[PDB]
Design a protein around this nucleic acid. Structure first.
Ligand SMILES: [Os+3]
Ligand SMILES: [Os+3]
Lengths: 240, 239, 240, 239
DNA sequence: GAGTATCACATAATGCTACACTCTACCGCATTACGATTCAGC
DNA sequence: GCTGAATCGTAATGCGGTAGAGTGTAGCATTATGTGATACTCT
C-alpha cells in the first residue's frame, strides 16, 4: 500500500520517457535506491505492466495497460461528469463542457441549476466560438497558424455586445496570461459565461459557468477562483 | 510482491467493466476484504482505480488511459494529423490499430460526427480474424507465425464470419491488393476496410469503420482514399 | 400500513370526483363500511389532507397536498429518467422522451447506448414531427381540429422514405388502434425508431427507441411489447 | 390515528426537498426506524413517496402531484387554453396562482422556451408580499383580513423589498389600476407583473414573470396584454 | 555503464475484528384500528 | 332520506424491539513483507 506509490512513480517516469529508461535514470527521476527499483521493476515486468527494452539498457511500459482499458476509461463525458456535478453543486450555476470544431464549439454536456432564474441551452448544438467564453478559451489554445482557420474573414455578430476581430484578439492575448475567458452578453443579452481550458491527455476542452449577468455582476472573484480550482483538480486527475 | 496482488485486482476490475465492490473483488481474487480495501485505496491514490459513486462501486482509473498517450507518444503524435484530415474527408470513424494476439489493440480512433455512427473505444480488443484492420495486420506476418496465431477454432463473432481455409484464402488477396474488407463479420450491420502501414515503427493498420447502409453505396472511393493516405504517410515514415 | 392503502383509495376517490363527495358515495366507490370511512376521513381532515364541503354533504381534497409539493414532483425529466434508464438498460438501444410543439417535437431528454453501432442525437433540438415516430405518436394524440395546425399545407421531406400527407394520415389512423408508432428511415437513412404515447397528468409525451434499422429488422415484437410495458408502468405511476 | 404518523413523515420529507433516510426521517419525527420503514413502504405503495436510487434516499411521490390536477380539474381545465395563447404571444413564463397564507400557491405555470428563462415549480410557495401575483391577491381582500395576513414583520426576501406602510400604499394603487408590479423584490434580477381574476370560482391571480433585462424595455405592452387576457377570461367566468 | 543475485534488519504490509451507514427482514406482544350500531340535525 | 357524529366490545392490526445483507471505513496488535548497502556479471 506504500511500495505502490513507488511503483506508480516509476510508471509515471516511464511515461515521461517513453523511448526507454534504465534503472539508473529511474533511480534519478525518483529518490529510490537502485536495488529497490530493481526489484519493483522485476515485479511489474512479471505482471506485464512493463517491458524490457532488450539486452540494452531499458524498460518501457507494458502491454498490460492496453490489456486493461475496459469499457472506455476514455470518454470525457463519463470522465468529467463527476467534476461537473461537483462544480455545479458548489455554485448553483449551470455548467458545461464543450470541444472545439473550427469556428464552432460542440456542447458535449452541461448541468442546469434549478434556480428560479435559470439559463437553459441544448446539448449537441453547434454554436459560434468567438461568441462564447468556452469558445474564447478553446481559441487561445490554438496556434497562430490554425487560428485564422477559425477566425475567417468576418465574425458573425449575434448582439450589440458581440466582438469583432480587432477586439477579440485583444482579449485572446490575455486568456493566455490568466487562462480564464469571459463573455459578457457577447452571445445572448443578459447572459454571461466564465470559462477555462482543460488540457487533457485526450485533448483540449472548455469548462464554463453559464449564468444571468445579473448575478454575474455580484459574484466574480469567487467563481473565477472556483473554475480554476476545478481546473487544477481535473488537470491533476486526467491532464497530461 | 504485493504488486502481484494489486495487479490481480486490476485485471479483476478490467474483466468486469461495469464495476465491482470490495466484496466482489475480494471474492474474485483469493484475498481478504480488508486487504483488498487497503490496495484499492493504494491505487485510487494514483488514479489507477476510480470510486464509482456513493453506492458500492469501483472501476479502473484514468491514469491507466493517461499512460498510453504517453506509452507511445510517437506514432500517435505524428499520425494524428493524417487521421484528422482523413477523418474530415470521408467524414467517417477512422481507426489506427496495432495487433496483440488474436485481437487488435486500438491505438487511436476518431468518431464520425454523423447521426448513425460507429464507435469502438481506444484500446478496445476485437478478434483480428473478423475486422479489416485485423485481416490486414495478419497478412503482413510470417507464413509460420500467422498459423500459430490461429491455433484454435477461430472466433465466430457473427454469421458471415470466416472459416479456416476460407480465411487462409483472403490472407493472400489482402497481401496483394494491399487492402482488406469486412462485411457483417465482426458485427451484424457493420463493415470495415483497412490498409497496412509498413513503417520503421512497426506494422500498424489504418482502417475505416462504418455501417452497411453506406458501405455498398461507396466501397471503392473509400479504398482509394485509404490507399492515398497510406502513401502520404509512408512518404514520411515508410521503409 | 394497511389502513393506509384504504385512506389512499379514498384520496383517489376524492380526486375522481373533485366537486365533492359524501361518505356514502365513498363507501360505494370503495368496499369499505360507512363507519370506517367516517374515522379515516376524520383523521385526514385533521392533518389537512382533506376539506369539509360545509354542513352540506362533502369532503374535497385538502390544502396539505399543495403544502407538500416540494422541489418539483412535477418535472417529467426527474420524473421519467428512472424509467428511461430502465428501458435503455433492458434493450441496450438509445431511448428518448420528447414533447410536442406544433409541427416540431422537442427532444426533452435521451439516453445513448454504448453499442459499437450507435445512434446519437442532440437534446433541445427541434425536429420535424411527421418525420419521427415520437412525432407520429404525439400527432395521433391531437384532435382533428389542431391536427391541421401541425400538418400545414405540405410536409418538409427529409429523405426518399419520408411520407406525404396522403400516407401519413393513413398511418395515423392505426396508431390509435395499437398505440405504438413506427418510423423506418422516414427521417434518417439507416435509422428507425419505435415510439409510444405517455398520457400523463402533466400532458402527453413521446417515449421512443432510436436504433439502426439493421438491428431493427431482427428485433421488433420484443421491442414493441417492451415499450408498451414501460408505457403501462409509467402510466400507472404518473398517468391520469 | 397512524395516519397522523404517516403525515408527520410526509411533512418531514417535504421540508427537506433534497431527500431523507429512514434514519434521518425517524430522527426528525419521534418514531423508531422500523416503524418509519413500515410507513414509508406503506406510502411508496401508493406513490405517495419515492425511493431515491440504490443509495440512501426517500422523497415525496408523484401521486402527490397527480392529486392536484385532479384537486381542481376545473379552473385549470378551462384557463389552460388562455394560458397557452398568452404564453405564445408574449412568449414568457405565465403563472396562474392562488393565495394561501402569506405565500402564493401556484396552481399552474408555463415556462418560456427562451434561453434565459424563469421557473418556479407548480405549487411553489413564495411570500405574496413580494411577488406581483401576491400583491394582486392581497388587494382583493377585506381591509380587516388583509391586516391579519400581515401580523408579523413582512418577509424581506430581498433588498428592494417593501416595508409596512410602503406596502399598505401600493395595496390601493393595485386595487385601482387593477395590476401590480415587482422589480427585484422577490429575487434580485427578477420582475413580475400580475392582474386579478374576479371569478365565480374564487380570486385567482394571473401573472407573468421575467428577468429585468427585458422588463424595463417593455413594461406597458405586458400590462395591456395581461389586461386583455383578464377581460376575455372574465367574459367566460367573471361575475 | 547496462541487469542480477545475496542476505541481515525492521520497516512497512497484513488481516484480524469493530464501525457507521444504507435498506431490509423477522415475529411475538398488547395496542390499534375496526365496523355493526345508535344518535343528531337537514 | 340524507348529512355527519358518537359509542363500545372485539381481535385484528399496526408496533417496535432485535438480527440481517449489503455498502465503505477505521484502528492495531502481530509477523510476515519488502527493504537497500554492499558485492556479483556480462555489452
Ligand atoms: Os477488455
Ligand atoms: Os415547501
Amino acid at each position: 500500500i506504500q511500495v505502490i506509490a513507488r511503483a506508480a512513480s516509476i510508471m509515471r517516469a516511464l511515461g515521461s520517457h517513453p523511448h526507454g529508461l534504465s534503472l539508473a535514470a529511474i533511480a534519478q527521476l525518483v529518490g529510490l535506491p537502485r536495488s529497490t527499483v530493481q526489484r519493483i521493476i522485476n515485479a511489474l515486468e512479471e505482471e506485464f505492466l512493463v517491458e524490457a527494452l532488450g539486452p540494452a539498457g531499458g524498460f518501457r511500459l507494458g502491454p498490460a495497460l492496453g490489456q486493461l482499458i475496459n469499457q472506455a476509461q476514455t470518454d470525457i463525458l463519463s470522465l468529467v461528469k463527476p467534476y461537473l456535478r461537483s462544480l455545479a453543486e458548489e455554485l448553483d450555476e449551470s455548467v458545461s463542457l464543450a470541444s472545439l470544431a473550427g469556428d464552432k464549439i460542440y456542447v458535449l454536456d452541461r448541468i442546469v441549476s434549478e434556480r428560479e432564474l435559470r439559463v437553459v441551452f441544448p446539448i449537441g448544438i453547434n454554436v459560434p466560438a468567438a461568441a462564447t467564453a468556452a469558445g474564447k478559451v478553446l481559441l487561445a489554445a490554438l496556434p497562430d497558424e490554425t487560428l485564422q482557420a477559425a477566425l475567417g474573414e468576418q465574425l458573425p455578430v449575434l448582439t450589440s455586445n458581440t466582438l469583432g476581430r480587432k477586439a477579440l484578439v485583444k482579449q485572446l492575448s490575455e486568456v493566455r496570461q490568466s487562462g480564464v475567458a469571459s463573455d459578457l452578453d457577447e452571445h445572448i443579452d443578459g447572459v454571461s459565461s466564465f470559462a477555462t481550458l482543460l488540457d487533457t491527455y485526450l485533448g483540449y476542452y472548455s469548462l464554463a459557468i453559464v449564468m444571468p449577468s445579473s448575478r454575474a455582476s455580484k459574484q466574480s472573484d469567487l467563481i473565477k477562483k472556483a473554475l480554476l480550482q476545478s481546473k487544477l483538480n481535473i488537470e491533476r486527475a486526467i491532464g497530461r
